[model samples]
Every structure is written in C-alpha cells, then in structure tokens.
Target: DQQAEARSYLSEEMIAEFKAAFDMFDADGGGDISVKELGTVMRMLGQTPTKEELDAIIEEVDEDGSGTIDFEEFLVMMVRQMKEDAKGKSEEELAELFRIFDRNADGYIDAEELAEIFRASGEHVTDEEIESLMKDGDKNNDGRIDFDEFLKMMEG
Candidate 1:
C-alpha cells in the first residue's frame, strides 16, 4: 500500500511541472544541474552559497562524479534523506515522525515546526530558511503546510 501510495502520489501533470522545474535548473541546456545553477535556486531559498558550498551539497546528492546533478539525481536527493531514515521503520513509525513535527498537535505543520524537524534531523538551517521553505510549500499562504502541501514540496 505504501508503494502504491508513492506511485499514485504524483500525477502526469505534476511530473511535467517538476520536469519543467528541472529544466529551469539545468542551465546551459546540458541536461545536468550544475552547482552554479543550483546555487541561484539556493540563494532564492534564503541561502546564498558559494560555488564550493554548492558543490559540497551537489556531491552529497550526485551519485555520479560529473560534478553536477542530473534531473533524476535532483529528484531523488530531495527525498533521499527521509527514505533513508524510514528504511527500518514501519508505516506507523514513519507516520509518527510526521506527528512529532506537527508541534502543536495540529494537523498542519508551520515553519517553526518544520525548522525543529530539520534540527532534529541534524540539519542546521536558519529561520530564513524555514520561512523560505514555507513560502514555497504553503500554497495558500495560510502560514502552515498540510500533508498534501508537504508532499508537493517533497516531490519538488
């Protein structure tokens, strides 16, 4: 059922949309996401990183040594950490992680909650980073992310 859920989660339109985003990130029309290209996106997301900083992030995600991230690698890198964490966990256990991040016991997760979750995951990001993520993920600008919104973010 989890596999089915994952498979059905993204529709054709969604796939096309993400592909378009990848196209945008893949500068030089080379079909690969360069660290320089991704750096701009990272800056837009509240982190102004240098070429080396971006390269470090690229290395963490890029399985190939071409010094760049392809569309496939970009997509997988988004959820790779979460999937790795969920490897030995049951469905309920995985779901519980979400609950834990839903700080006020609310059904939705706010930027603060998300930041805390990132902290727990050992990623040290600033408030600006959380707000930047929320601004993109909170589609309705309602100040919080619902499950569907979170999925949309993860899909990106």
Candidate 2:
C-alpha cells in the first residue's frame, strides 16, 4: 500500500518510533486503534478535524481499514499531511493555522466554529454527529481540546 511505499525509505529506528506513537494512540490499549480515538487525538493536536475529515484522512492513509494504524500508516500522515515536503504542511505551520481558525479569542474552537468550516468546505456533518465525534475524539476525557495534547495524537 502507499503507506508502506512511503515508509519503505525510512530507517528501522524511524519505523520503530512511528509504530510506538501509533500504539500509544490506540488508547483502548488495543494493538490496533479505533477511528474515533484517532480523531480525538487529532482534535487535541489542533486540526479541529471532524469525523468526516478523519474518515477521509484515514481512507487515504489506511489502505485496508484494519481499524488500526501501523508504522507505515503513521508515516503516510506525517509525510503527506504534516511534513514540509511534497503535498504536506509542516507541523509548525499546521499549528499556526489552527490558532488562526480558532477565531473566537477563546483558546479552542468548539463545534459551532466547526459548522462554519464544514460549511465552507461543503461538508455535511450534523450537530449530533459532531458531538458524537467530539466525544470519540476527546482523549483524556477533557471537555475541550488543546494544541499540545493534539500534537501527541499526530506524532510519529
């Protein structure tokens, strides 16, 4: 799959580091991760991502949908979305963008803000669905998301 193709160029240590991060994010402590849990992690990081966004990201990254992401899967996200090369955004830039998107002067953007972003993107996430995804994505059981916390979710 594309994941393997991308990571194939990495050193063994890099692969191990990526896998370690992936395993930790699988909060159920399961060897594999559930998609909701993954999204919660990302939201914490600052993407302010929705479930539809999460699903779309995974579909592109996770070739088989084993419900869990592996080292290669981790690499795809890092290199493709969060990296500076190719079609990627540097992690620092992504973080800055999140700050901009959080328009309210509030520390974080809530579901209401997401509605606007989704609307602009032509996304169709319902309020109830957003709530469900938030609950799923809110790791540490915190009611709100924070940037560094979200960073952990994106790490590899």
Candidate 3:
C-alpha cells in the first residue's frame, strides 16, 4: 500500500524522533491528538492555520471518524510532508513563499525588502548577507529577484 511505502521512508530512529514530537501534542495521554492541540504544535513550528484549515486537515486524516488524529494518521501526515519537502516545493507553494517576502506587493524581492522579511520572520540576517543572497538570486543583476529568478533560486 502507499502508506506502507510511506512508513518505509523513515528509519526507526527518525520515526522515534517524530513520535517524540507527536507525544508532545498528544497532551492528554489519550493516544490520539485533538485539533486544538495540533494547532498549538503548528503555532510552535511558526505556521498558523485558520479554524477551517485545521478542520480540513482533520477531515483529511481522521480515518476512524472520531474527529481526532491517531498515531497512524499522524505518522502518515508527517511522512508525507517530509517526502514532499524533500522532493522540492511545488510552483504554487514556492510562489507563495516568495510572495510573503515580496513586501509592498511589488512582485520582486529587493535586498531591503528581504531584510525586512527576515526581521519580521525573527531571523537575524545582516545587511551584507542580504546583499549576497540577493546577488545570488538576481541573475540579471537588476538588484531584485523577479518571479523567474525566484523560481530558479527555489529549484536550485
């Protein structure tokens, strides 16, 4: 089964680490996780989902119709997400990441904008490092990363 293949992607050590993380959200020792607890964990990881989004996720994984995620469901999601990230971002997701940093909605990420984004994201990046990063992605040396350049950067 596809899930069997997904389970095989992680070694015992890696799965154990994921299990530790899962246990953190399984706060009540109930062997299953509630959406509220899952939302807390997501916020801890810097991703915030709306109620509808959380509902959609639970609906996707709550195979037992219990309205909660069991260990098997948790493992399925974690493994699938890991595989997707390892394979590289989809065009839409990559574009969304870029859009988040393209402040002012200018459709390009200049060094100044990137710096602001880094700061807002709670990262400590220096001006020189930002310039260097821009240089690496600004293929035409136009001092900004356009969508095409951004796509190339993400692919690389």
Candidate 4:
C-alpha cells in the first residue's frame, strides 16, 4: 500500500494528513504510477504544480532515467536498507544531495537559502513560483528555510 509505504519512508504526521491525497492519486490500484498520477496527488493536496514540477520529482525517483515509474522503481530507493542499516552517502553523492539542502554549506537551507537552489537549478523562479514554494515550504514562517524545511517541501 502506498499509504503504508509512504508512512514508512516519509513522516507519519504528513502521511496521516495526506493519505487521502495519495489515494486520490492511485485511483486504479494497479500498483504502478504515472505523471498524471502525480498530477492527481497535487490536485488533491490543493496544489496544482505544473507538469514541469511533476517532471522534476519524477526525475528524482527515476533510477534508470526512464520516463515511467513502476512501484518497484518508486519504493526501492526508500526501502532498500530497512534491515541492515541506512546507507550512508558517498562523498560525491553526499555533496550533490547536500547541495539541495545546504544553501550555505554551513549545512542547512533556510527560505532565503533555497533561493540559491532555485537559481542553481536554472529555473530561477522569477515571481509567483518563488513566493508559493517559500510560503508552502517555509514551516518556521521565518521567511527563511533551513535544510529540514527544504525536506518538508519535497516530502509534502
């Protein structure tokens, strides 16, 4: 179940709140997912991020760089190390993922911190996208986002 798997990998608090949202996405229960499936999830959550947004997320989960995601492709990344120990990062991979969260390399992304990320990613959110993400992801409401805050944006 995606609901169960989501809770296992993501935060339970978020899982409980957004389970309805996920179900709205996996409408057929066939166990595979598509980009439109993600659109449904976004719509259910009161968000309607663009196809480009969905592509970015899909890109993250697409291990083989394939355009589609089956259930195995989706969950394997999250559950691969449940038994032994969570895999630690390699220096290069660590640096890459860290860059997503670490705006200052002091090790964290604050609201202003993520502005750097947006810029680095080449989209360089000009107007509303910037405001919307900050408002949605800025959990502390401090007009800034730390690494933890950045994580919430993705998980949500």
Candidate 5:
C-alpha cells in the first residue's frame, strides 16, 4: 500500500531506479541502511551532508526510530525527493511533464487518460487507485487535472 501511494506521485520506473540506488547504498546487504551508508549515498549523489545533517535526515524518516532506513523509509525519502525535484522546476518544464500524461493534448488529464498512461508504462494500477489519484489531484472537484492542479500536485 505504501508503494501504491508512492505510485500516485511517481512512475514505476522512477521507483525502480530509487530501489536500485537504495540497494547500492545497502552495501552490507542488510535489510536497512545505516547513517554511514546514507552518508555515502548522499556523497555519491553530489551532496556533502555533515554528520549532524546525516543524523537529522535519518531522524526525519526513520519512523520507527530503528536508527536506520528500511526500504519503506527509503521509499518515503524518494517520494520527498521527487517532490523537491518538481518544486525546483520551471512552469514550462512542469507543463511539459504534464503533457506527457495528458495524452490527448486536451488541456486536462482525466482518470481514464491517467490509467492509460500507467498501462502504457507497464505499471499495474487498479481502477481504485486511479480513482483515488483523480480525487486527490482534482483539487476543484472537477473530476480532472488541469494545469494548475497538476502544478499544485507536483509542488507538493
């Protein structure tokens, strides 16, 4: 269910990419990633977080306070990263991204179009999930995602 929720914000390919990166960071083959491993991962990603920052990062998403990041926690981190990436993009870039899902070029993305895009991407999303995404993204309750709604969703 956590993955399903994440899929609402990211494509399956993006999730897979994050999983691969997570696995690479879990160098000791443990089911969880420690702060040291997270530090290494961040450094490799071109981020140089200090020790205190690393601890804070772990504290923020280590929901169970296990002092490490499990795959579920990693997914949450990836979703947050995805949102942050979106937030830094220009409106034109966001619109370009939206156009990819608004297949008909109809200026709005409906539930059916969303389902189609997911299917084409080989992501197994249930009708209920699509409906849920529609409900959440259609902020004005118009039953579709306009450019503004799409922007807000991405900016989350």
Candidate 6:
C-alpha cells in the first residue's frame, strides 16, 4: 500500500520504467542500491562519478540514511527530477492532448475537428462559439491549431 501511495502521482508505465532503471543499478538484488553500485552503473554508462559525488547523490535520496537508495527513495529522487525538469513532462502531456484533438491525424486541429469533438461530447456549442474557440487557439491566425498554439492555449 505504501508503494501504491508513493506511486499514485505517476502513471503505471512510468513507474515500471523507473523500476527498470532502478533495478539496473541495484545489481545485487538486495532491494537497495548502494552508492558503489550506482557509481559502477554510471561508469558502465560512460560516466565516472567521483566518490564524493556518489555520496552526495545517495545522501540526497537515501531518506533512511542507510547509505543506499531503496525503491521508495528512488521514487523520491525521480519525483524531484520530474519537478526540476517539468518542461519535458508538460510537453509529453501536451503531445497526448494534441493527438486527441487532431482527429484527422493532420498534425493540426482545424475548426471542424474541434467542433466535431465538442459536438460529440454533447456540449451544445454553436458555430459562433466554435469560431471563437478557434480564434483563441489559432495564435498565428492560420485557421488551424498547431502544437505550439495548442500549448499556449492550454497554458492560458
């Protein structure tokens, strides 16, 4: 239950990916990844992190101060990383939305596409409303909403 609770904010697919990465460094199957193992993994990946750097990395994530990273501690580090680099995560989210809205697979959402989805959802949106929606989203006045414009609209 604690693991589930710790994992609540991330998708199951993301959790699985993180777990795989964690397992790669937790080579001993000890349920906790030691600083030495982390350093070795980094070196194997073509980076030679010094001992002090490795210690700091472990210190930042080893919540229990056991000089190692358990799965939960790894999750904490991951969550922190996600927050620090939110642009990537937000872009992925926006891409998913863009895919859903670009119904014709044209890489852009035209007025008709937007209207169709709205109408399908029983929103009772009028033609004027659809036009207004397009106006708000089509920042370049190109008559279609590209990913950049869509992201701006969503951010607003």
lDDT of each: 0.76, 0.67, 0.83, 0.62, 0.85, 0.85
Model 2 misses residue 14 by how many Å?
1.0
Off by over 4 Å in 5: 1-4, 45-48, 91-156
**All candidates: TM-score:** 0.44, 0.46, 0.52, 0.35, 0.51, 0.52
| Residue 86's lDDT in candidate 4 | 42
Candidate rank order under TM-score: 6, 3, 5, 2, 1, 4
- Model 4: ten consecutive residues of lowest lDDT: 82-91
Candidate 6 lDDT over 12-73, as tens digits, reads 89989999998977999888998889988889889989999999998887767799889988
Error of 3 at 41 (Å): 1.9
TM-score attained by model 5: 0.51
Question: Model 4 TM-score?
Answer: 0.35
For residues 47-66, could you state the per-residue lDDT of candidate 5 as single tens digits? Answer: 98998999998987788889
lDDT of 2 at 151: 55
Evaluate model 3: give its TM-score: 0.52
Clashes of 5: 0
lDDT tens digits by residue: candidate 3, 1-156: 545665788789988998898898898878888888878888888997997787789887777789898877887888878877866656568878988988788888888888988899898998889878999998998898899998888778
Determine which window of 10 residues in candidate 2 has minimal summed lDDT: 81-90
Q: Write model 4 residue lDDT over 48-117, tens digit each, in one string.
A: 7898888887776676666656554555434444423544443345447757656467765555566666
Residue pairs clashing, model 2: 40-137, 44-150, 45-150, 45-151
Show where candidate 1 strays beyond 4 Å.
Answer: 1-13, 81-156
| Candidate RMSDs in order | 17.7, 19.6, 9.7, 17.7, 11.8, 7.0
- lDDT score, candidate 3, position 23: 91
Clashing pairs in 6: none
For residue 34, give model 4's deviation from the true position in Å: 45
